[PDB]
Amino acid sequence: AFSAPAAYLTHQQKVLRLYKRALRHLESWCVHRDKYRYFACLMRARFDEHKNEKDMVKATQLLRQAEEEFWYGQHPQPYIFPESPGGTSYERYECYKVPEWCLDDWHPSEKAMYPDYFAKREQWKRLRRESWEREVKQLQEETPPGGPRTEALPPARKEGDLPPLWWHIVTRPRERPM
Amino acid sequence: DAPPLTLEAIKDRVLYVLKLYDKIDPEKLSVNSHFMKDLGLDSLDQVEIIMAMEDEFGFEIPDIDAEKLMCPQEIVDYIADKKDVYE
Amino acid sequence: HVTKDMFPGPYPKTPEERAAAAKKYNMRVEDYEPYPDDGMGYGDYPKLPDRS
Amino acid sequence: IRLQEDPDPEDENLYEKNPDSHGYDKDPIVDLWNMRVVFFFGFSIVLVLGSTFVAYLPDYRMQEWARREAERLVKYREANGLPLMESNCFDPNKIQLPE
Amino acid sequence: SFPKYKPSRLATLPATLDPAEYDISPETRKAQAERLAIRSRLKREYLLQYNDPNRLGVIEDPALIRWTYARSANIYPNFRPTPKTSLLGALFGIGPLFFWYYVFKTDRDKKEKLIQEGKLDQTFNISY
Amino acid sequence: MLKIIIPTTMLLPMTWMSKHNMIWINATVHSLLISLISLSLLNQLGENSLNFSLTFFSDSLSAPLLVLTTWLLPLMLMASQSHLSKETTTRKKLYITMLILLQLFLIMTFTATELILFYILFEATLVPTLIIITRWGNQTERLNAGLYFLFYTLAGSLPLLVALVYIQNTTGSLNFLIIHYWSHPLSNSWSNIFMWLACIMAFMVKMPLYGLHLWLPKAHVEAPIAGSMVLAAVLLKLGGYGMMRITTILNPLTNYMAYPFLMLSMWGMIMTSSICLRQTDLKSLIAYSSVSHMALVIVAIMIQTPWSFMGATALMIAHGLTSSMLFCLANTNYERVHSRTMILARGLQTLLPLMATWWLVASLTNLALPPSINLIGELFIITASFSWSNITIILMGMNMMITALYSLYMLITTQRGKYTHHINNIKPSFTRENALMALHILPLLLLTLNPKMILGPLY
Amino acid sequence: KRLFIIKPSGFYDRRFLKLMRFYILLTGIPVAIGITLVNVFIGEAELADIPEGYVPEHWEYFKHPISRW
Amino acid sequence: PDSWDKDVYPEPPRRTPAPAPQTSLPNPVTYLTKIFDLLVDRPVTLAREFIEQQHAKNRYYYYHREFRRVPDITECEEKDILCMFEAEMQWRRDYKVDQEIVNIIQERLKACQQREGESYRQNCAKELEQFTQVSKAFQDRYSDLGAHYSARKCLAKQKQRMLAERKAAKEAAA
Amino acid sequence: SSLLDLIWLETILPKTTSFIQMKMSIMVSNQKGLIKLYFLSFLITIMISMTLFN
Ligand SMILES: CCCCCCCCCCCCCCCCCC(=O)OC[C@H](COP(=O)([O-])OCC(O)COP(=O)([O-])OC[C@@H](COC(=O)CCCCCCCCCCCCCCCCC)OC(=O)CCCCCCCCCCCCCCCCC)OC(=O)CCCCCCCCCCCCCCCCC
Numbered sequence A: 001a002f003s004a005p006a007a008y009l010t011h012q013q014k015v016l017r018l019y020k021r022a023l024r025h026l027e028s029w030c031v032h033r034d035k036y037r038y039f040a041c042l043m044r045a046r047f048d049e050h051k052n053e054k055d056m057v058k059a060t061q062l063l064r065q066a067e068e069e070f071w072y073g074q075h076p077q078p079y080i081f082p083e084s085p086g087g088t089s090y091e092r093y094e095c096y097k098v099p100e101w102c103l104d105d106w107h108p109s110e111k112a113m114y115p116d117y118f119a120k121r122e123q124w125k126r127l128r129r130e131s132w133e134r135e136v137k138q139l140q141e142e143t144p145p146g147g148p149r150t151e152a153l154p155p156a157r158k159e160g161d162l163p164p165l166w167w168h169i170v171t172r173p174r175e176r177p178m
Numbered sequence B: 001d002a003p004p005l006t007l008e009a010i011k012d013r014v015l016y017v018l019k020l021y022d023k024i025d026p027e028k029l030s031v032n033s034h035f036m037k038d039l040g041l042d043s044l045d046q047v048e049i050i051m052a053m054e055d056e057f058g059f060e061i062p063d064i065d066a067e068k069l070m071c072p073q074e075i076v077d078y079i080a081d082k083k084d085v086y087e
Numbered sequence C: 001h002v003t004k005d006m007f008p009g010p011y012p013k014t015p016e017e018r019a020a021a022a023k024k025y026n027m028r029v030e031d032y033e034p035y036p037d038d039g040m041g042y043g044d045y046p047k048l049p050d051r052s
Numbered sequence D: 001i002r003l004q005e006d007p008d009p010e011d012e013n014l015y016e017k018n019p020d021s022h023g024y025d026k027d028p029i030v031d032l033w034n035m036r037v038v039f040f041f042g043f044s045i046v047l048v049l050g051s052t053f054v055a056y057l058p059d060y061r062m063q064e065w066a067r068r069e070a071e072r073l074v075k076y077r078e079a080n081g082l083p084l085m086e087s088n089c090f091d092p093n094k095i096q097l098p099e
Numbered sequence E: 001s002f003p004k005y006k007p008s009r010l011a012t013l014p015a016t017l018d019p020a021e022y023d024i025s026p027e028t029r030k031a032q033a034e035r036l037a038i039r040s041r042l043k044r045e046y047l048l049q050y051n052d053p054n055r056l057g058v059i060e061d062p063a064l065i066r067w068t069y070a071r072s073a074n075i076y077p078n079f080r081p082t083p084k085t086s087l088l089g090a091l092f093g094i095g096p097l098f099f100w101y102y103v104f105k106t107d108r109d110k111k112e113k114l115i116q117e118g119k120l121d122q123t124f125n126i127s128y
Numbered sequence F: 001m002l003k004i005i006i007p008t009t010m011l012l013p014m015t016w017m018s019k020h021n022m023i024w025i026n027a028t029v030h031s032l033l034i035s036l037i038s039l040s041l042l043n044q045l046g047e048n049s050l051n052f053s054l055t056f057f058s059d060s061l062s063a064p065l066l067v068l069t070t071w072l073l074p075l076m077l078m079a080s081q082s083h084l085s086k087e088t089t090t091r092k093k094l095y096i097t098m099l100i101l102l103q104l105f106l107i108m109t110f111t112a113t114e115l116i117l118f119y120i121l122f123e124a125t126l127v128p129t130l131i132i133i134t135r136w137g138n139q140t141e142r143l144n145a146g147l148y149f150l151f152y153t154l155a156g157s158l159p160l161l162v163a164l165v166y167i168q169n170t171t172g173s174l175n176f177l178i179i180h181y182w183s184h185p186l187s188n189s190w191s192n193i194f195m196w197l198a199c200i201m202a203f204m205v206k207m208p209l210y211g212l213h214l215w216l217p218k219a220h221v222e223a224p225i226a227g228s229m230v231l232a233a234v235l236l237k238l239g240g241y242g243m244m245r246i247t248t249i250l251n252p253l254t255n256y257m258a259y260p261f262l263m264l265s266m267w268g269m270i271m272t273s274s275i276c277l278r279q280t281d282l283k284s285l286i287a288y289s290s291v292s293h294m295a296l297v298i299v300a301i302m303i304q305t306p307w308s309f310m311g312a313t314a315l316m317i318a319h320g321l322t323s324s325m326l327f328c329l330a331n332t333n334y335e336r337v338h339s340r341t342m343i344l345a346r347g348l349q350t351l352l353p354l355m356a357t358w359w360l361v362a363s364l365t366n367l368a369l370p371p372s373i374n375l376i377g378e379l380f381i382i383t384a385s386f387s388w389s390n391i392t393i394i395l396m397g398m399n400m401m402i403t404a405l406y407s408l409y410m411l412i413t414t415q416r417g418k419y420t421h422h423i424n425n426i427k428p429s430f431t432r433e434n435a436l437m438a439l440h441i442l443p444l445l446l447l448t449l450n451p452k453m454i455l456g457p458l459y
Numbered sequence G: 001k002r003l004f005i006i007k008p009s010g011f012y013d014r015r016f017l018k019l020m021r022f023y024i025l026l027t028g029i030p031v032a033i034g035i036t037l038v039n040v041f042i043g044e045a046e047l048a049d050i051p052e053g054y055v056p057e058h059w060e061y062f063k064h065p066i067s068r069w
Numbered sequence H: 001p002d003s004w005d006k007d008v009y010p011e012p013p014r015r016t017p018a019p020a021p022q023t024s025l026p027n028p029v030t031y032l033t034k035i036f037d038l039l040v041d042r043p044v045t046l047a048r049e050f051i052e053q054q055h056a057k058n059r060y061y062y063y064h065r066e067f068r069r070v071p072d073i074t075e076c077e078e079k080d081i082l083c084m085f086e087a088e089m090q091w092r093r094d095y096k097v098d099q100e101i102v103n104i105i106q107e108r109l110k111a112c113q114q115r116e117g118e119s120y121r122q123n124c125a126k127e128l129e130q131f132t133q134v135s136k137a138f139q140d141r142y143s144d145l146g147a148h149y150s151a152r153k154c155l156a157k158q159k160q161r162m163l164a165e166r167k168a169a170k171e172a173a174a
Numbered sequence I: 001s002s003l004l005d006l007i008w009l010e011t012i013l014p015k016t017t018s019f020i021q022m023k024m025s026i027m028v029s030n031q032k033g034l035i036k037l038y039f040l041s042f043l044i045t046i047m048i049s050m051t052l053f054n
């Protein structure tokens, strides 16, 4: 989520993702911890057996057959963490996330109810306003003429600058806002 | 509800898990030790370490982000940033 | 701010028209494929995969 | 460009000049009195007074009158052994059928 | 070996089971790079507008405008009378009308015939 | 009726002689006063109508419509003052004048005692509406919408004029009381078939009937907020009122000529609800919901039983109020983000709570939720249709299911989910908008409390 | 440690609700008091036979005092 | 109670059995009834006594409107608009009165069903027959006139019914 | 939505009538303004009125 994706997954990345998914589904099948440890050791033994293979075509064929085996033997109801996309507690607190632009539409009485918070908020707003030109200049200087080849973003190269395109990442709502 | 996390608590828990890992020597394990450069592990070992951390903290780290956590300090910083821990 | 050239148009019948349509929708010319010209009103709108 | 055209103006926010704006008028006093007249007349006058007026509208539909007439007819007809509901609306003697 | 999984339209084919996922030509990699470049360009434009401090309003989406225009206003100009369109329109617009007319006509004719024959249970049927 | 007619013709010079900043205040105050005055028409008799003079009369069918019109005018004034802030004084006064003329024509239409005067007034209602649409619409399509609306209505209504003058020549009078008392059966002939067709087709186009309804999305989507409010709440009820008035002299030909219209109404009710399920525009969704409800009203009028007419009247009043409220809510959303796309603005419950409450109540009234007058009318129509035939229940159940589906789909799409991140100009809801919603919703609940006021003469 | 909770403005919704309640209760409470006093003191009319030779009025044909008025 | 007519709204005499306890345990129902009478019934009775005392000081009367009979549509000539108007109004009033009569009979039926409870199928046979007869007559009178019903249409229906009865009697006698 | 509402209900009643009116308008108004042509038309009209009308 925090990392910019690449154009494709390498063979190492594919096999590692298959390894993690197979281990998780095996844990779903093997509920108890000792049984899961035993069968996970056997699974890693299989992966180690096929670890050293010079023939990339054969390695890809092994990966494909392993993927078919995983799809046949996957748990119909695999365990999902509550906050994970398939989880039960997924997106439950999205209705509680409110942004700071909505925060600055408050009435003067509401703002007066929090005098110290809004002073620091004004400091943050000044920091945002005093850096946008430097950020856009840095972005347009470092980009290739063809355009952005990837979604990655650069850091601040100067002692007094900020990383470009930082405001919403830094001021995103808390994971438990209310 | 639950007590809030702290940077020290996260670091202690991740070092606890790593010291309970058998392939890692507890004496030479520091918070800046690299998993493959100076700990001598490999990709499957790192995947199992990330899975152990997921089990420890009760949340999933996506594969796109988990491949880059090659250091206990990196894992601590990732978890603190995701859980909004600043102290 | 959108101009008249940025709106969906008729079914493309030439490689130049298909290239222009693909450029309009921010797609590759190789990956752009219109709906078949059955006279159903789709025009040059892309036929993206039927996934969710 | 093909014309000497004005730029599209920015959207105007009523809360910027007047934080306690009711959304009626730019002028504060005019907006406040527009709110006051709308709320007073509409809510109080129309809603409350018209609702109680409609609630206490006299029984000009003669529902209760019809009920009392029905009570009298039922009492009279069941006292004398007559049918409660008559078979015909009109008088067959006063009706003249064709041959 | 293991039983094969048959994709459907409402149950598609997973990526890990796609045969083309394991036959990657060097041109496939450059196509993926071009797609990523397009996505990165669009993302950069959107993020610049989104993080602009002086922006107040809605970042207009030409893609959304095109979708809403093609769904509503671009249909008739690109519609042609073809055998397929003619038959489908005739069926979907006329057939149901005649079907329901026949159903209700038959039901009401049977009911009226029962009424005339005087063998339909209409006791207590006061409200109509 | 002059005690209500003259105050509108006095609203005109008051609007033109008031100051530049006081036009909205004066118009709203005096419109509310006129509505309160017109509330006295609800005291109706159980035997006959209120025959004020040779020209005007009031009935249990006309009274709720007149009260609805007089109540609808100030809400239109509020919405118009919302969206016409930068206009010039003369053009503001012209818009208010168009609204006042429309209200006056509608009042005289609902109270006209002759069919030819009724025709003249209900055709006169077109000019202010056309001017409003094609002049103060926001988009380019307002011109095409006005052309479609005008030509549909006129191509429907001209044969009605010919039929009315023919009926006057044949019978001696177009007075409604005389034609009701002196009515004679309509024999099955081609001439009578085409007379029935002329009258019914005029009012069906006004309804609108399915297959004669494209002008309704065209005009309703492209008209300004006040025009949208008046088009759905009142102007669609002229067709139903006319059909409930003319069908006195169209018997027994209505038993045999109503089959195509009943089939069109039922199937197109289903089809327009399904269309509502897949609308990318909120105004279009509201317009098609209006089409479905008026198709149900057409079914009631065509089956033509005392239980169907009461349901028709109740459903007309309820639909007017609910559709006006829905258009107002969608217009507030549009005034926020300057676009009518439904999926553009999301998370509006977390951004504007009380507007989410108003949306919830409006959607719950849009679907037949007991004991609302919407459900009262729909249930009466469904019971009458059940007595008519026993598969109409299948069609009505399908329509109710789809109605709930698309209403809650609109609610969940607009209000629930997560807000659009880049939309950062959604200011808190105005007191004026909240008051508009409250004035839309409270009378509906009070009518639910007292339901015999909107059940028509057949009660 | 107490953390600031970011919420939309509730001032305007609260103000509208307060104004609506005030203006409904501005006339509603007096109307309720008047209705209660009328019902308690000036009760409803009693049904009676029309005296011979007497011609009543319509408000004499209605029952509740407010409806008669 | 003298509020309504016992003949129009009959009630069978109420037979309540006397208490015959068989245990020394106190009756919670009796104790709670005593509490209810002490706490609620006496205050509401005093309040109603005060209210009725206030009502007795301002006694006034309202009357039931009497309508004399007028010639009906059978007596009215053709296109005699005034006689037709009077006859139509009288027919509408009679229609309302008949509707309320049917309502009274239905109220009788519902009350008897609820009262008899578990023996309603047998003890309510008298109120079912009265409802059957009343509804039959009302249906024969105003069954299928339509939304635009009138005295002329009802008279045409009665004429059709009379013609059918005459034809049936002639066929039977043949 | 598309096949019936946006295509065929538009094609039948409003679009076909507008097309016919436009075609007839073009046909009527497409004249070169030649007195020889429309006076020949006058002669034809006079002959038809004399013969076919009695
Ligand atoms: C902001 C958001 C919200 C917006 C909302 C929308 C906007 C709304 C706008 C306004 C709408 C207005 C609509 C029109 C209203 C017009 C008035 C009307 O229709 O009145 C109706 C009508 C009024 O009576 P009426 O028909 O005019 O007179 C007939 C009789 O002659 C009368 O009987 P009576 O003469 O024998 O004596 C009765 C008399 C006197 O009664 C008594 O004295 C009773 C005493 C009881 C206790 C006695 C025992 C305790 C004694 C303690 C002390 C003992 C020792 C001392 C004793 C005294 C000294 C010896 O009391 C009254 O007359 C008062 C009745 C209530 C008047 C309400 C006026 C409303 C005005 C409209 C505006 C309202 C705006 C809102 C603000 C309202 C104010 C805050 O009936 C009622 O009001 C009934 C109230 C409820 C009774 C119980 C009902 C059954 C409850 C259970 C049902 C099942 C459960 C369901 C759930 C729970 C319920 C939901």
Ligand SMILES: *P(=O)(O)OCC(C)(C)[C@H](O)C(=O)NCCC(=O)NCCSC(=O)CCCCCCCCCCCCC
Binding pocket: A011, A012, A015, A022, A025, A026, A029, A046, A047, A050, A051, A052, A053, A059, A060, A062, A063, A066, A067, A069, A070, A073, A074, A075, B042, B043, B044
């Ligand atoms: P680290 O970076 O050292 O990783 C080393 C890797 C693996 C990247 C190697 O360097 C490498 O690329 N080796 C050659 C490629 C290769 O290893 N291919 C084989 C991969 S799949 C494999 O052979 C093991 C699959 C067997 C297990 C399949 C699991 C299916 C069962 C799951 C069922 C679900 C519930 C149990």
